[PDB]
Chain A
Amino acid sequence: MMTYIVFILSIIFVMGFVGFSSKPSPIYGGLGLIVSGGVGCGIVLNFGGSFLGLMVFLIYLGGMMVVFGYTTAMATEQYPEVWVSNKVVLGTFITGLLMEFLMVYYVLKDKEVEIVFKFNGMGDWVIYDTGDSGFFSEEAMGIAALYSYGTWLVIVTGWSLLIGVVVIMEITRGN
């Protein structure tokens, strides 16, 4: 029955990600972020991405583990609040949900929405690859760049990471 499945997974992503960015307690935010990263990996995987979504799932998720470690270490309230606790938190969460359901309504019962661009309402099996007899598998050769042609780029990226390491050590050392 389903053919809008990337749009559907994107709606689940927008739900979890608005509830993420509505700022509850950051541990609930990280719950929202792991849900959002998982379904975003699902979006880019089911679009046709081979590995890069599972890659960013891994990387971005270990980053969220570090963010959990610091939000537990540094500062929490006497009682941490959840989405449905406060006036403002519940209000922003439900109005983000209302924007989501309202755009689903004004796409599914309409032709197009032009808030910033003419968005075409139908799922993205169009436009799409017409079965290229490749066997070179585009993302594999794509990340097989940065090494053959990518000379200067990995130089400045690794140099930025080395500078990042010495910068973090000297900021904590600056006492």
Chain B
Amino acid sequence: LLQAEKDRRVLQMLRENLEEEATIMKDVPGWKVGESVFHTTRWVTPMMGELYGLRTGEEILSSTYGFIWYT
């Protein structure tokens, strides 16, 4: 159940964040909207910036650094 919850949550962040990207970069030339970094086509494991980018400081700070130096 935790596995499937993490799945739905990271797919939600990926879909909404590619929509964020397609909104925010759609004026500068070059830049295909959602092409892969890699030459193959598999589910690459993300990096906590593909998920947690531009979440304005506090959210990424409590996400990526909470377990390290708190509780």
Residues of A within 8 A of B (CB): 1, 3, 5, 45-48, 125-131, 133
> Once the chains are docked, how many angstroms separate the CA of A48 from the CA of B64?
10
Q: Given contacts A125-B65, A128-B47, A130-B48, could you give 15 more A-B pairs where the C-beta distance is less than 8 Å? A: A5-B65, A45-B68, A46-B68, A48-B68, A125-B64, A126-B47, A126-B53, A127-B47, A127-B48, A128-B48, A129-B48, A130-B45, A130-B47, A133-B2, A133-B3
Residues of B with Cβ closer than 8 Å to A?
A: 2-3, 6, 10, 45-49, 51-53, 57, 60-61, 64-65, 68-69
Tell me the interface secondary structure of chain A in the complex: loop
Contact B48 A126 (CB under 8 A): yes
Distance in angstroms between the alpha carbons of A5 and B46 in the assembled complex? 22
- Chain B residues with Cβ below 8 Å from A127 are 47-49
In the bound complex, CA of A47 to CA of B48 (Å): 14
Instruction: Give the nearest-CB partner of B51 in chain A.
Output: A130
- If A128-B47, A130-B45 touch, does A1 touch B57 (CB 8 Å cutoff)? yes
B residues near A131, Cβ cutoff 8 Å = 6
Q: Given the complex, which residues of B lie within 8 Å of A133, measured CB to CB?
A: 2-3, 6
**A129 → chain B closest CB, angstroms:** 7
